[PDB]
Amino acid sequence: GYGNQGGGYGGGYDNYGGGNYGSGNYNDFGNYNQQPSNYGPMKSGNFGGSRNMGGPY
Amino acid sequence: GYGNQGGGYGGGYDNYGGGNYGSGNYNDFGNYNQQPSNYGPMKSGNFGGSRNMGGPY
Amino acid sequence: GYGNQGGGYGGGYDNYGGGNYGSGNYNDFGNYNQQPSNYGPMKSGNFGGSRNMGGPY
Amino acid sequence: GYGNQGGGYGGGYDNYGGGNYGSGNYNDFGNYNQQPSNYGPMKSGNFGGSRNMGGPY
Amino acid sequence: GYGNQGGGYGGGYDNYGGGNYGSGNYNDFGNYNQQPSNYGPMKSGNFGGSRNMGGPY
């Protein structure tokens, strides 16, 4: 039984290439750029996992 | 039983390549750039795991 | 029984490549760059684990 | 019984490659860079483990 | 019984490669760099372990 009557199966997440993958924010400051900046804060939610908040049993 | 009536199965997370993977933020300051900066704080949520906050048993 | 009626199974997390993997933030200062800086604090949430905060038994 | 009615099973975390892995922050100062700096403090949450904060028994 | 009605099973954490692994912060000062610095303090949360803070028995 895979998470029946509940969270189930998160899935299959496979990365075979470079660059960013997931929930984290990605700042690529490029090529030959003159003074690039962000000034922006970054908050990235949770990655994967299994969480049960089910009601009374 | 895999997390039935509860959190279930987080899943399969496999990384076969470089670069960032997950929830952490990624700053790539590039190539031949003149004074690149961020000024942005970074907060990254949780990676994987199993959490139970279920009600009364 | 794998975390039935509770947290369940966190999952399978496998890293076969370089670069960052997880919840920590990644600063890559690049190639041939002129004075790259961050100025941004980094806080990274928890990695994996099993946590029970279930109600009364 | 693996963490049934509770925290469950944290999961499988396997690292077969270099680079960073986990919750610690990663500063890579790159290649041929002119005066790279961070100025950013780093705080990294917990890695793995099992924690019970369950209610009254 | 593995942490049933409680913390459960922390999991399997196996490192077969170099680089950083865990919750400690990683400063890699790179290759052929001109005066790289950090200026950033590093605080790293707990690694593994089992903790019980359960309510009244």
Author numbering:
A (entry chain C), B (entry chain B), C (entry chain A), D (entry chain E), E (entry chain D): 263 to 319
What does the paper say about this structure?
To answer the question of why the mC-hnRNPA2-LCD hydrogel exhibits reversibility, we determined the cryoEM structure of mC-hnRNPA2-LCD fibrils to a resolution of 3.1 Å. During cryoEM data collection and processing, we found that the mC-hnRNPA2-LCD fibrils have only a single morphology, which consists of one asymmetric protofilament with a pitch of 600 Å, a left-handed helical twist of −2.88° and a helical rise of 4.81 Å. Contrary to the globular proteins which form 3D structures, the mC-hnRNPA2-LCD structure is confined to 2D layers which stack on top of each other, forming a twisted in-register β-sheet that runs along the fibril axis. Out of 161 residues in the LCD, 57 residues from Gly263 to Tyr319 form a fibril core. The mC-hnRNPA2-LCD fibril encompasses a PY-nuclear localization signal (PY-NLS) and the core hexamer segment containing the site for a disease-causing mutation that was identified by Kim et al. in 20132. An aromatic triad composed of two Tyr (Y275 and Y283) residues and one Phe (F309) residue is buried in the center of the fibril, stabilizing the structure through π–π interactions. The solvation energy for mC-hnRNPA2-LCD fibril core (−19.5 kcal mol−1 per chain and −0.34 kcal mol−1 per residue) is comparable to another well-known reversible protein fibril, FUS (−12.2 kcal mol−1 per chain and −0.20 kcal mol−1 per residue). The structure contains only four short β-sheets, reducing the possibility of steric zippers. The multiple LARKS motifs introduce kinks into the backbone of the structure, disrupting stabilizing β-sheets into segments shorter than the six residues of most steric zippers, thus contributing to the reversibility of the hnRNPA2-LCD fibrils. The PYNLS signal forms a hydrophobic pocket between P298 and N300 that buries the terminal aromatic residue of the steric zipper F291 in the fibril core, yielding a significant amount of the stabilization energy.
